[PDB]
Design a protein around this ligand. Structure first.
Ligand code: 9ZO
Ligand code: 9ZO
Ligand code: CO
Ligand code: CO
Lengths: 381, 381
């Protein structure tokens, strides 16, 4: 059931912004590890005396990495005279965010029809304002409201190239890396209490609950009208046998924040081959692979979707597989992206639900919690 | 002239420590960009609840990357009960250092015969103490004094594997990258006034001035007894035609700090080939190459040291060449390592002064300031 109750017109995920200590080093690491190309910049070389911001792209996926310069460079500026390209940026907020949470997502940005309207409607419906609508070069409007913890939901709308004030990157500095990642599928928050988090976000967006089907969590998913913007939220389940990874997150993150970004690949086999080649030479590591029993058990569960060779390819790469009543999900998880056991990345590809492919086809892999557990125990004996 | 006036016994450069916001991402970037392998770690997985520290090595070169965790993880600790492996570390100092200066060198560490004695003698001779001598597992002693700005000179001495509390890194996580870098040749500070900086450092070390032979700088070099520890210091020259890069450094760094690290390569051609292959895929960029006139002029200046083919190889890679009365220097400079136009890296190789090779053979390339200028002007016409 999809009541299509969005209170404003939402299009697609637009970009994800990381707040960093040094944007250069994070962006270069992510570019190599994920196969994303350097696409735009806003920094000292473009006249920005406030923050350094670097944009990586792969297909429609946009990762933005931002860090503050010394406030002394912009001491004489005021907001009306700012050289910042992102008017919501604040030195003190950025440093406090990073000192509190470490490296992580500050902004989940969605493209909307009218960011000014989306902001007004959201706040009228309970959203806590974070940054009011600002029109950039009469061309792009940006606004922000609080999502959870210190993460904001950023609205962007275009009259009609990332943002005014950003420059396209020189061809020589823009190596065309591509491991097959194409868009952001979903962005997941960890909170202490799921109930109030859902009520708050669903309250100001009109996003509806997306239908699902001792893991340490309870979860629910909020979706836009066409279910292409997908925002799952988790809370811990306490007293468990093994300590909840949601609770570990909240402790090391100093509270609620973004837990994982799921990146859709047009060819998850090639993406995982390319990322795993680079794990130990600057890229990303992956969670330990499931035992062979997990892949033996794949034949009975998805043998009508994947050949034995394609299942064997899943086993080589450590890929997990889950299935809905509608579609099939191939997924895998990186180890944490930085120092803290907080944010990580999921790579996914979805099979089925053709009409284009409908959003969330195959679910989010929650069935893999028990299938992993079963496969571990079976492999022991 | 070398009066050999060290006030304590100094051996070699031991390691350089960067203070980071996220040590994981900087270390992974540097590892790929410079060809250094992951060698040791001290972090949550080793019981360190205070800081994450990752050690890269290439030959004898040791780069340490450290960032603080949330203070909440270690809230119940006191110094006598600390889980930090580096007892001088302080959350507040680290965050203040990084917020003030951005990514950069906190510690220039030299191995000494007795770090306790070196510290006492240094402070008795005017050194400003930063962290007193601490004995780690009855095996290693570490002490720190102020060098310039917020950079410390760290003394380390061993009774007899990096530091107690560090673990050797798993073979699978330790890819054996190597582009030929072998040791730290010199570490350079930028200060507002060279005179007092030299008097202070030479005062507490007994290091002597190393003999040299409109660039924006005045410079001098302090050296240990065998001239293997080399600490150049620069100050700006104001009112210049082009603005002094030393002054730009001080403005963007918020004052004095480490300007560049010079890394000796056993094969600068191979190092530069490997680093340049990786510049646009996560590694380091290099300064713009000199015009062909610079390499035409090489034949008259070093044609007795390098063949035409080796000079042509310098031209392919953008390598600079300078010469002493004793030796020849091959050198090249990276663009800044992070967001701010502050710290950068120099790759060098020295030809001559065989006895082993004596320290500083060929100088530091100051002759390349005028040779660059001349070659630029000549190439214009
Ligand atoms: C996150 C995840 C998902 C997932 O995507 C997701 C949603 O999108 C929304 C619904 C709730 C939810 O869970 C599905 C299955 C997972 C996992 C997962 O995380 N794990 C491993 C634990 C430890 C990994 C880890 C890696 C790095 C750092 C910390 C923890 C699994 O085993 N399954 C099987
Ligand atoms: C540093 C450097 C050295 C050098 O090593 C050095 C010493 O060891 C001690 C003595 C003083 C000194 O100078 C020698 C020659 C250099 C340079 C140098 O820097 N430049 C370029 C300017 C701009 C580069 C830059 C790169 C990245 C960011 C900011 C500035 C040169 O042209 N020559 C020719
Ligand atoms: Co997911
Ligand atoms: Co130098």
């Amino acid at each position: 059931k999809n009541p299509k109750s969005d209170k404003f017109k939402v299009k697609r995920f637009h970009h994800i912004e990381f707040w960093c200590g040094d944007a250069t080093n994070v962006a270069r690491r992510f570019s190599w590890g994920l196969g994303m190309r350097f696409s735009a910049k806003s920094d000292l070389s473009t006249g920005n005396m406030v923050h350094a911001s670097y944009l990586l792209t792969s297909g429609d996926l946009r990762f933005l990495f931002t860090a503050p310069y010394s406030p002394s460079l912009s001491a004489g500026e005021i907001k009306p005279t700012t050289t910042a390209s992102i008017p919501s940026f604040d030195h003190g907020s950025c440093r406090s965010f990073f000192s509190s949470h470490g490296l992580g997502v500050r902004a989940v940005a969605i493209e909307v029809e009218d960011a000014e309207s989306a902001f007004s409607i959201s706040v009228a419906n309970g959203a806590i304002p974070s940054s009011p609508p600002i029109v950039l070069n009469e061309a792009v409007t940006i606004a922000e409201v609080k999502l959870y913890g210190d993460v904001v939901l950023r609205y962007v709308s275009y009259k009609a190239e990332f943002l005014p004030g950003f420059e396209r990157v020189e061809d020589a500095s823009s190596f065309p890396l591509d491991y097959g990642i194409r868009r952001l599928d979903h962005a997941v928050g960890n909170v202490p209490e799921l109930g109030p988090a859902l009520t708050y976000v669903a309250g100001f967006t009109g996003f509806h609950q997306f239908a699902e089907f001792e893991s340490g969590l309870n979860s629910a998913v909020l979706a836009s009208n066409d279910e292409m913007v997908l925002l799952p939220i988790n809370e811990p389940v306490h007293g468990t046998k093994r300590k909840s990874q949601i609770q570990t997150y909240l402790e090391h993150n100093e509270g609620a924040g973004l837990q994982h970004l799921a990146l859709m690949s047009e060819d998850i086999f090639r993406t995982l081959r390319e990322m795993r080649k680079r794990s130990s030479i600057g890229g990303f590591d992956f969670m330990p692979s499931p035992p062979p029993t997990y892949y033996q058990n794949l034949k009975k569960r998805v043998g009508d979707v994947l050949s034995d060779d394609q299942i064997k390819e899943c086993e080589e790469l450590g890929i997990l597989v889950d299935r809905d009543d509608q579609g099939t999900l191939l997924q895998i998880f990186t180890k944490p992206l930085g120092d803290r056991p907080t944010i990580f990345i999921e790579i996914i590809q979805r099979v089925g639900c053709m009409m284009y492919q409908s959003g969330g086809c195959g679910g989010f892999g929650k069935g893999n919690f028990s299938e992993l557990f079963k496969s571990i125990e079976e492999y022991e004996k």
